[PDB]
Amino acid sequence: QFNPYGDNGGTILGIAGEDFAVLAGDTRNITDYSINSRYEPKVFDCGDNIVMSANGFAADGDALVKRFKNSVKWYHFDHNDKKLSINSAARNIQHLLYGKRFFPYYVHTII
Amino acid sequence: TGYDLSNSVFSPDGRNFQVEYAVKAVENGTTSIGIKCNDGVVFAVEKLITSKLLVPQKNVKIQVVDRHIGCVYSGLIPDGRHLVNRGREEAASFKKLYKTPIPIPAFADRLGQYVQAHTLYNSVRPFGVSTIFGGVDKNGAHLYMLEPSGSYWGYKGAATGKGRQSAKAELEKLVDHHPEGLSAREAVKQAAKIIYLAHEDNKEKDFELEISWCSLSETNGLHKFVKGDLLQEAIDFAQKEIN
Amino acid sequence: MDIILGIRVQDSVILASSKAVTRGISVLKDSDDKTRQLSPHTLMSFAGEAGDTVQFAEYIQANIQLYSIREDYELSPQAVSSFVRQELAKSIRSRRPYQVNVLIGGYDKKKNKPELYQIDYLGTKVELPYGAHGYSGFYTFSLLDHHYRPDMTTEEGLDLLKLCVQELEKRMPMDFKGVIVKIVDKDGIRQVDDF
Amino acid sequence: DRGVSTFSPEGRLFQVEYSLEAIKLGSTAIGIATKEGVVLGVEKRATSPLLESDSIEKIVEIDRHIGCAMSGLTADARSMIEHARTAAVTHNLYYDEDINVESLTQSVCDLALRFGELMSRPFGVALLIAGHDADDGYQLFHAEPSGTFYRYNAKAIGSGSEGAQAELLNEWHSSLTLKEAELLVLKILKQVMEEKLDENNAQLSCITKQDGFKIYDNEKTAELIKELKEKEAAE
Amino acid sequence: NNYDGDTVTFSPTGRLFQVEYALEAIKQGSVTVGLRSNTHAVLVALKRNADELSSYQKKIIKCDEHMGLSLAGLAPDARVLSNYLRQQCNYSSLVFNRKLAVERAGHLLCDKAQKNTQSYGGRPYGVGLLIIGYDKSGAHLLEFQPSGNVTELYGTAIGARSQGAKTYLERTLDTFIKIDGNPDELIKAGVEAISQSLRDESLTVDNLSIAIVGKDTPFTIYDGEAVAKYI
Amino acid sequence: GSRRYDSRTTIFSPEGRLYQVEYALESISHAGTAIGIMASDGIVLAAERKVTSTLLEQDTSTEKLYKLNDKIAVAVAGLTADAEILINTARIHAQNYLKTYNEDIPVEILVRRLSDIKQGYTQHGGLRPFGVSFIYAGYDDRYGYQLYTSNPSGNYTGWKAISVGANTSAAQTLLQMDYKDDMKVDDAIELALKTLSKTTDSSALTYDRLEFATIRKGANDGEVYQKIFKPQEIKDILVKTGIT
Amino acid sequence: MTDRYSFSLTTFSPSGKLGQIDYALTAVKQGVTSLGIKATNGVVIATEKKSSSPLAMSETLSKVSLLTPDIGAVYSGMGPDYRVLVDKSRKVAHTSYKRIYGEYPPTKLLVSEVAKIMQEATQSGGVRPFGVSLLIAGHDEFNGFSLYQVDPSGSYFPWKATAIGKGSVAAKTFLEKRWNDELELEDAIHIALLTLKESVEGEFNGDTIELAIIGDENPDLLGYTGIPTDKGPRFRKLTSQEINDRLEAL
Amino acid sequence: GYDRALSIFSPDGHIFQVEYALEAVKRGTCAVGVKGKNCVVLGCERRSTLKLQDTRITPSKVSKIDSHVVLSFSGLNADSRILIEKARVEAQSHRLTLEDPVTVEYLTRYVAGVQQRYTQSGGVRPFGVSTLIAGFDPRDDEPKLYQTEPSGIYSSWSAQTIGRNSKTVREFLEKNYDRKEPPATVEECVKLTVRSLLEVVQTGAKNIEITVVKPDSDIVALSSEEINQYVTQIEQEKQE
Amino acid sequence: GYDRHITIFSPEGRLYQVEYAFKATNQTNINSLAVRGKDCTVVISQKKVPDKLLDPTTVSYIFCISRTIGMVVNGPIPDARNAALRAKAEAAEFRYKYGYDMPCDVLAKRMANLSQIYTQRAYMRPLGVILTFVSVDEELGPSIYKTDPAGYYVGYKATATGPKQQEITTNLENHFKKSKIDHINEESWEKVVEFAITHMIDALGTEFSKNDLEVGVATKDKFFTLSAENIEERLVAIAEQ
């Protein structure tokens, strides 16, 4: 039987300051007991001053980040180069994720 | 009448006038030729220069289908492209099912049936292009020309566009004065001449010459464009003959 | 949800339907009318899978009301039951079937005679003097076999129903929080406002 | 006949141009944009004295920050309003924010050329879409059945428009206040309407960043009619 | 005449009048100019208002970071076509992780427009477009025409009176073609070229629109106070 | 395009008439007259066949009177082939109502759906209407005996007595004249034939140019019998009423 | 883009005519004469085989067709339309009857089916009516022998005897004299051969005539034995010879 | 399916098929409605080119959409059946999802929109019908009367008429209806309605129909007998 | 005049579009002829190559439809190829579904029914062609069946088609009046081909070199066309009269 999911390990971390915020993640990618790469970054700049990590099953994680980055591009095109508020990003991501509600993205996401 | 206002209606003669009107659009186009040589084919076309603002070399008109077929056309350029995209779908799906790349007669009838298809209904317009195409296959070389009606045949040489007649006469000469065969590189020169000779009729503006060829010995059976040196060598050969 | 009963007397149909709604471990509500009125002289009670029961009743109700308006005419209880049976029999081979059992009690004004129809979620219909759905039958069908006679007054029918509810309160494991009782007769539907 | 989507030799779409004729037959609609707000007003034009005048809804809310006035075949605008409302509410659901007035307009304008052998003919109604957003402030847009929309400081549409627009050309300046604009809309309507302007055959409305889009009561406009009549007695 | 009823019909000379009338909508459109050196490509467009109270219809649309077009004719058609183009650029990015060739954008546009000239019930696009981009083989300028004919050039203009700017560039060819590594000079020449297509009005702050893309320049648009610099 | 050859069958005249309905109605005015008369205790259907040749198989035949169910029958005026399409439609609709409600279909309900079909062909779809007019003769246990007519427009109306087809102007005035509400079935039978006799566009009114049917209360009480007359029986009733 | 003709090509003219049906009837009028006669124990249908060249082999072109083992058809008008009708008619005899009830359809019912197809070309989008009139001759256990006529309108009528095409007016009159309600089949064959001779220009023999009957059952024509209830087809084409035999006693 | 755009614009900015639909309404038998102070009365002409009608079973001219809203119409009868049915369905659908019967405004707006849809869809002609929709909103005693027309526009009316010779009686009602003073009694409103029909109707006979709607789903049709008494009554006040 | 543009009846009951498709039939100005041997069926058509630029081998109106079926077309090439491809597809599909080779007459009927539809359904035009199918059928022996734009088809003893058809038809008509048999009574296909070319010469009153003709022969289990030489050999034997 084909298992469509995997698990590539890693861990991520976000803390908010007064006028700053951080998003951190280790750079190790694994399957079972092997190391795939010792440097495979999972925290990404998505423009409009938003950083994103989708930790869990890398293929689902990459798919998502990629889609949200595209969401940013089209938000600019469709609404006259407006800036995407961090809260509007968050909401847009809810819809991205819940869109696959019955075949989920195996990722715990932080921006 | 009314017989000519709708595509696919027979006039009482037995003609479909709208195909015939499409022919007029072809006749209004720039000149293109095909020469079938010993182990290949050569294609050339007249590219008129509307302005010194056209980047020379950067408005390519001869198109390749698969790896081994070249097509060129006179008339409505968009139509020609649309027909080539179909030829590309036809040739890919042939290769997908049968593994062998599509034979040239086989390919000719795929374009043939599809063009003919546009003479069958009033809800499409016929193709505004005559197309000269061909290449090398498992059985040697093949040159073909295909009219808006869907008619096509194999050719020793062929031509269409404004310069259709002079080119035609110049090709007829070649068939007589080289009955045993014409070589790949010879035919590249000859093509360059005949485009120049048939630039008599679109004398208005001046032009850019463009050639391509598909020779089993010279291009290894693949379609390539004639560029740089061998191109200029044949431009020169044709400067020499309008003298 | 749980228990639904009905008995046709001389010239009325009496429907009794349990008042409790239970989700798992909690009795969420104890005053639930498991009933829809389909037309002035027709009543349908229902029991079965949650959501499905009301969705079905309300859908049937809407359909019958639309018919009433179109023809300016009340359908006979036989016809309404035959419609409802077909709706269920249709759904039984559905992708997701309706999981609802019903009793249809109505007064046929054209033949002055009450009628009671018992139809399970499969679209299995029968006309009965008295009927029940699920586990209620097991306890009451023996009482009714005995004490029922075709020419009972409406209060004789209610007293007979009282026995039926009492036996269920004695021996049913589930606390069904009493019944809502409704009478259907020549002058329409009304509810006995305590039991 | 000939195609529904055909070009004239002039290079314009027949069916669009004829729709533009039907809009000219429409009742008058005027909008003026100010740094304090945007005002929309319309001629109601009850076709008989018996028709209950306030059942005429030619000014209509899209969201709390966007309003709409119409002119022409007004039944055609029903579905344009529906689409606009849905687009606005939808965008708020996807983004937790108000949709930009220009974006709303562009969305409505997409609909408009979606016809031919999708609907069978263009719309027979022009729209004045007026709203406010944080990035571009107060705005007034003219949305045609051609698909094109223009932004106006002030604009008039309908049968009174040719005159009315010329009048707006003289009177609009960049420092108008809201009360001034309200009066100015009332003035120009009175001027172009057949029947005599009162609080029953005309209607006013505005959109402010603070209280959003309100249609005015009949009692409230009545006093601005009074105030206008009094002002014009002076000098 | 009888043969202009639709696109599916050829005239007896072999012409498609529906396409020609579409070509006509362009010429009523406001003028716009394109031109490029070896390092940059510039669009300059003359914007048109409806009256003294209206905005100035935007005429330049961005397609990707490396590509964009100006329009003259039916703006909704330009919006459709620019939108189609944005998607193709975005698909090249997403699937192939490859910024889309300006030349391919050309062929894709040609082919989309051709569909609408051969089937019944459709209509030709009623707009002309100028496409500039900086791609893997340098600066580029393309002239799209709704007949389907797309053309690569050093410079051109389309719309009303465009014929003035087009002969101007035809002279100025060897000057501007070598404005490499200067953005402001290349723009200057475009602003001068667009001036040959003026009458009765000349270039004010909120009627002029300029766009530039090139070697180290993302396709960016300049309007209003940002173009005062060039008036 | 294809538009060039499109009649547009579903459009308004500048006076607001549906051209195609009108011309179909005109078509029906040349069809054999059919008459329906309703009594307090039954209904009569009578119709004239299109000028029969002497070789046509007279007895095993139907072109005017068709059976919808056990309680309802129709008389046809117009194109026979069009009518049969609509008839089988109607016969199914009848059977569905039975399967759904376990009750025979009320007469009006069947008439409404058939009329609603006709209406559809006049508003959408771009096809020609059905060149058919019906007299519906039926019984139900709500309105007793009922007569209706429907035409290509999809309009229907109820009648005590009515005609369709040829000479309905003449035929309607004759009926208006000698009809009374208390009238019994055997009188209506006689009225019907007398009326065709006066409006027929040929000289003799013989049995071989008639179809005839009665729906009587006549049976074993409460139940309704539907009688499509054999040719011998039309001859018998034609002599009995003294038309021959 | 395929069939854009989704509107009627037959419509009512101001006078109330349906032009295309009228014209289809005109086309039938031109067609070679065919006829049918009901006997008491049989039915005969007949028509003229009129060849385009003498190089044609006209036993190949067959104008009288079997539809079921007890039903046959003949026509007048356009042959190609007739051909596709016989095809559709044979299939419909199975799909909507035999596959349901296990027996072949009765004559009137199958005729009803054909009429329905023919009617539909009168109304459906993007088609002309059929250009034929059919004569269908059949027997079924509960109706006996019968003969029907189907027109381009899709209207049909039963006949004791009739003819259609070119010389029908004359031939209907010839039949009217000779028909009685006591004709044995051999007599109707004889009458049919006489009636057909009036309307025939050229040679008149077994090779220029196609003639079939719906008569008795033919066990010799069944192909198998062993089911006593299945008795073989009642439809039978007469041979070139069998026709000529009766032109002797003509 | 049949695509053709049957309703399109003309060079003068008119949609002829819509306007020719109004012509079919013009021709339709007259219909009127009047708002009382606590009722609405719907009156309807019935053309008298034919008696011998069974009037038990011929479709009556005022239709119940729900038990608290009715609808009359002028124009094509077959067309009106479609609008009515659709409206009746939507009316039950609204009760199912919203748990409340429709408002007269809502239902009018729905029917109006169906009519509008048919003016810009392929393969369809507009409805040759205009309507009066009248009734009382749920738990509301203030009366409602609305009108729709083939274009799809709709609005409220103190009183209104449609159909043949409606221009005549709109004149009469404009002259005979004080907005400051609506017909107080039911009797009063019914009388004003018959009076306006008699400007156009011929005999009082089987030519007039009246239907009366009071609040809380209180709808009754008047019988010839009682209508006769209104005809007789106004007649004998013609003695001036 | 629109009852002349699409396939609907004219007032005199005619389909003008079908008639005009018959006129396109002759537009190639080519005559074809078919005859039956005992073992074979021969078809000959005129080969006319006007242009010196054409590759003469690509110019042909005889098609190999299946292993056993040959088809010669009278009419414009695009419609001919269209009909050829379709009949090839139909022949192969028939073999797949029913487990035996499609017969000449059956294929002829099938192609005729397709043509019939174009005369009834409005959006499809008729093809401007006449299709002469040939085989040696396993059940029927040598077979010639022909199809037109009307949807008509029939079997032949022999046949001819084209502008000069009538002269050829009557030439053959007369031979069979005399011979009194259904066929060319000859052992080899070689001599039946010779017969065909002969009576074509006589009827058209013209002379043929090896490149003025095109010949297809159908035999037991294969149908094949002849080359320049197989013809030249055959013309040369004709020289010995």
Side-chain angles (χ1 to χ4, degrees), chain B residues 4-5 18 21-22 24-25 51-56 58-59 78-79 81-82 85 118 122-127, chain E residues 3 7-14 36 107 110-111 114 117-118 120 147-149 151-155 170 173:
Chain B
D4 61 310
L5 308 166
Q18 270 266 127
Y21 292 2
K24 293 294 195 189
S51 182
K52 41 244 138 200
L53 293 181
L54 315 182
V55 185
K58 297 279 83 180
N59 285 301
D79 285 26
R81 274 189 61 76
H82 167 51
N85 293 147
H118 292 63
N122 70 230
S123 63
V124 292
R125 139 178 92 71
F127 277 87
Chain E
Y3 305 85
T7 22
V8 86
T9 311
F10 265 120
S11 80
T13 29
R36 59 96 166 173
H107 310 315
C110 157
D111 287 346
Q114 188 282 141
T117 76
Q118 186 162 199
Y120 167 70
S147 58
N149 297 283
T151 313
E152 183 152 20
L153 308 154
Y154 302 112
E170 234 171 348
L173 176 51

Side-chain angles (χ1 to χ4, degrees), chain D residues 159-186:
Chain D
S159 57
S161 77
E162 210 221 290
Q165 187 65 17
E167 193 64 62
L168 284 163
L169 213 324
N170 300 344
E171 299 266 39
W172 186 89
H173 60 104
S174 66
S175 310
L176 269 145
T177 69
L178 195 74
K179 284 157 165 306
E180 279 170 57
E182 297 173 344
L183 258 34
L184 205 42
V185 154
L186 254 0

Side-chain angles (χ1 to χ4, degrees), chain F residues 28-29 31-36 64 75-77 133-135 149-150 162-168 171-172:
Chain F
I28 299 166
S29 78
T33 319
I35 286 167
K64 290 274 170 199
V76 177
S133 282
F134 286 113
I135 299 161
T149 46
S150 67
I162 191 72
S163 54
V164 290
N167 306 302
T168 52
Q172 205 54 22

Side-chain angles (χ1 to χ4, degrees), chain H residues 2-34:
Chain H
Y2 188 61
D3 219 353
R4 268 264 260 177
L6 299 188
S7 317
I8 61 204
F9 282 114
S10 299
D12 55 323
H14 284 184
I15 304 166
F16 280 142
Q17 281 288 115
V18 168
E19 265 152 48
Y20 302 172
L22 256 165
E23 290 312 304
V25 173
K26 258 194 198 42
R27 164 178 302 88
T29 88
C30 184
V32 62
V34 189

Side-chain angles (χ1 to χ4, degrees), chain G residues 131-142:
Chain G
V132 298
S133 281
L134 315 171
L135 294 173
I136 294 137
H139 176 264
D140 61 87
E141 211 221 334
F142 275 84

